[PDB]
Swiss-Prot record, chains A, B, C:
Species lineage: Viruses, Riboviria, Orthornavirae, Duplornaviricota, Resentoviricetes
Protein name as annotated: Polyhedrin
Keyword Transferase part of the UniProt annotation: no
Native organism: Bombyx mori cytoplasmic polyhedrosis virus (BmCPV)
Protein's job: Major component of the virus occlusion bodies, which are large proteinaceous structures (polyhedra), that protect the virus from the outside environment for extended periods until they are ingested by insect larvae.
Glycan attachment points: 17, 169
Record's keyword terms, sorted: Glycoprotein, Host cytoplasm, Late protein, Signal, Viral occlusion body
Any Gene Ontology CC annotation: viral occlusion body
């Protein structure tokens, strides 16, 4: 009964987090020319996005990670002539699934930048208008820098149970 | 007629400010370990919220204040494990009314922080979709720091006719 | 056929940029007491706005410029007593058209400031709800300072094909 009630209560949050009331989160990792990882996090209800400008301090590559509640088909990205520029690309196809014990812990899109990048990304939850408007207002933004990837892995990634893929293609995350 | 027209024209803005065309405002006061008060203000139409990160410069407590146009039932707050975190609490019950001459001048929710806090709050007006979207774009954000509460009271609170509750539980504001 | 296909393919973007899928852009130029021009740009789908605070470094005047996709009637502005303040003015009437070869390249509203200004502006495109919400998340914000107007004209304005009006009332932009 300590394992029955423990596991009959563990699945009372995967069928909740995946149920609109569940948040949807995104991380944008900017990997820098000195190996330091800067990470913007945003968590929100209904939909979530990030819009930041990444410049010297020089940025080399990008990883964007969604919680498994996102509708991968809904992801869009806007990278920065105005008269002939499209407002975004639907890059969901380019996201690789991050698995732990055969469970999706997140989705990772990784790409390098040619040797200052401006970046926006948006995704919607898997699935009244005033509720969504409030959700924009309640989205919480966390922004941190880490000197080396291991430092981010050891103190940002592993303590917080966050889905990740480090530089040797090791998947971090927690199966539920 | 100088008092008739003066008071028959004074109520031609309480039945307007409370009529959607009326703004709805929020103040988040962060009270700091050296007694200084930092204040974020935001005013907007239809709905209004604040999302800021409060860190050292160390923050000790918080007061959030709504203009009387908010629907107190609509207020939500998001304070900052991701897999089991709710996106907000409905904290309207916890707001005390701020009265002046028996009139509600605002609503105040005060709480202390355990001895860096991240904070979002949202509220909706008392009571087409493109109008609300524009309203997000037109929300104006004012951010100030004050060395002591009296300095905030004397130069931020009393000059601007803003509803407030200082540390001795004195209510500031203007009846209309 | 090098001019037929060249010009039968040139109009396959003015009837696109003006078709919702087309972005809508705004620039807010803050002209400073030392003649330096600071410029905030934002581009987006469906609707676009800017909300910035302009202070010393002192700001003297403002020019706001819309791409020709905006509905000029939709423009609103919010400049910063709370109990009697309107949330915005509909300033579309005050915008002058910027023409190049008899074609509208943008709309310019210019005004001076009395001798720290807070400013928001919003406009909608000329002409499902989740698409607009994502569009807020995907709006890209560019912010630059230039030491003199000529420097902005020469390196920000002329290279990027941006509609502009400099201080001698010369219209910059590209006809399409």
């Amino acid at each position: 009964f300590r394992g029955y009630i423990l596991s009959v209560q563990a699945e009372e949050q995967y069928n909740y987090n995946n149920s609109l009331n569940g948040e949807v989160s995104v991380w944008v990792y900017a990997y820098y020319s000195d190996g330091s990882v800067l990470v913007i996090n945003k968590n929100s209800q209904y939909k979530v996005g990030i819009s930041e400008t990444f410049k010297a301090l020089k940025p080399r590559a990008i990883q964007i990670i969604f919680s498994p509640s996102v509708n991968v088909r809904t992801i869009k990205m806007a990278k920065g002539y105005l008269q002939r520029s499209h407002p975004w690309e639907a890059t969901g196809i380019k996201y690789r699934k991050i698995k732990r014990d055969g469970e999706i812990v997140g989705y990772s899109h990784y790409f390098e930048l040619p040797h200052s990048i401006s970046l926006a990304v948006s995704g919607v939850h898997k699935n009244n208008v005033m509720d969504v408007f409030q959700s924009c207002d309640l989205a919480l933004r966390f922004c941190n820098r880490y000197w080396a990837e291991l430092e981010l892995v050891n103190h940002y990634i592993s303590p917080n149970a966050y889905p990740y893929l480090d530089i040797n293609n090791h998947s971090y995350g927690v199966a539920l």
